Design a protein around this ligand. Structure first.
Ligand SMILES: Oc1ccc(-c2nc3ccc(O)cn3c2C(F)(F)F)cc1
Ligand SMILES: Oc1ccc(-c2nc3ccc(O)cn3c2C(F)(F)F)cc1
Lengths: 11, 234, 235, 9
């Protein structure tokens, strides 16, 4: 669970 | 990778358009800063700047071709370097002052509001003065910032080095455009890339400081900023 | 002096100014401890620092500096220079760090000291990079000289940058003799100077680790090494 | 400083 994960693949 | 077939001008045009906005501080009350007050503004600004940084990275040629894990790694490693070189670049036309935000222009003495911050302030001001004396161009800045992103965590890969070489060609192409001689071209290239060593150094000092404010629980940090901080393990 | 040297004279001076490769105490009979391994590293470093001082003064342009300026540059870059030397010696020993000809450590041995593995992996990674780039000796002595002059230049200075530009001309001159194209010359130059960023990173990490070992009182540091450590002021 | 003396020698 990474906030950075979500931000990268959502844009 | 579409980044390799890009011309030098197409590389410059891509980086310029990818530029993140200049955000404003959560402060428009003017109220002489305490320690928790200034740390609050910086972290709040950084937490909002980080979001636009991810958008910017994705528009950096060659970064979309990377694994999600590899993308996370490069950002976790250089996010503070990218924030600082942006800070240094905005503060360029403001000698002795740091432009964190258009409504947040801090000098050295305001660095004394936070303990250990003064040493970091002087280093940032020293880099800003260096950029100013070198007359850094915006086209060069967006190259160096992109270089930091791809380079800082690459030894922690052949494609990344191919893009890094491509940005080097872009920097040379810019200097040749400006009318520099071959000798002046590789000299200035060397001058710019050696500044990245200090940008790295300022980040490392900034990490320990940000971590120090975490353990002292001076200012509550966002979970995102807390995740980026944990990626260094201090 | 320094501004009047040819590229070849610059290389010759730096090659001639090279410090010797010292040996570690290390009795292979003696089992490893956290204190033992840290002791070997700090004992070696303390003896290497003396030669580094004499090396620095034989670096073109460094003698022309203020005595206080010389102290500053060495205090901020002593571990960087120690590490880039370690990386260079370990270049032909994949998976191993050549601290000394008789002291060859791998990743697993680094786990004897806590928080050392992370530094070991970085040092090993840099060594692999030098190996991948096939770093020449002439290029190494330049990069090491660049670190000495550049690491603390922002923390007179006109002369320093003039020498730094001179070393850049030297690196370019080296690559041109190697048969590289103008594009390949600038590219490799960039690849080399970006490694110095990582070397800086390993230094700051090594400092915090060395300071950590100091406060934990696992290893007695020499009074010189203690002054070198206080020059950064950490935690 | 120790570094000071050794640089002087
Ligand atoms: O654009 C930027 C916004 C903030 C910062 C920044 N500067 C510091 C200094 C010390 C410290 O502990 C943290 N700092 C941060 C932050 F908040 F980003 F971490 C730099 C550029
Ligand atoms: O030639 C060299 C001698 C020592 C070192 C070195 N490596 C470390 C690693 C961790 C640490 O805490 C200290 N280290 C040192 C020392 F002691 F020199 F500072 C590197 C190259």
């Amino acid at each position: 669970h990474k906030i950075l994960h979500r931000l990268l693949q959502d844009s | 990778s579409l980044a390799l077939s890009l011309t030098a001008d197409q590389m410059v045009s891509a980086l310029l358009d990818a530029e993140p906005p200049i955000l404003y501080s959560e402060y428009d009350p003017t109220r002489p800063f305490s320690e928790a007050s200034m740390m609050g503004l910086l972290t709040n600004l950084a937490d909002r700047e980080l979001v636009h940084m991810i958008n910017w990275a994705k528009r950096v040629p060659g970064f979309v071709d990377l694994t999600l894990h590899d993308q996370v790694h490069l950002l976790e490693c250089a996010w503070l370097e990218i924030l600082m070189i942006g800070l240094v670049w905005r503060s360029m036309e403001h000698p002795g002052k740091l432009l964190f935000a258009p409504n947040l222009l801090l000098d050295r003495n305001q660095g004394k509001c936070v303990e250990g911050m003064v040493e970091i302030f002087d280093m940032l001001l020293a880099t800003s003065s260096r950029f100013r004396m070198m007359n850094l161009q915006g086209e060069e800045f967006v190259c160096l910032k992109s270089i930091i992103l791809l380079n800082s965590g690459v030894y922690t890969k052949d494609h990344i080095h191919r893009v890094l070489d491509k940005i080097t060609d872009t920097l040379i192409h810019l200097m040749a455009k400006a009318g520099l001689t071959l000798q002046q071209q590789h000299q200035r290239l060397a001058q710019l890339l050696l500044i990245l060593s200090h940008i790295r150094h300022m980040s490392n000092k900034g990490m320990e400081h940000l971590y120090s404010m975490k353990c002292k629980n001076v200012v509550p940090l966002s979970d995102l900023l807390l995740e980026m901080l944990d990626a260094h393990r201090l």
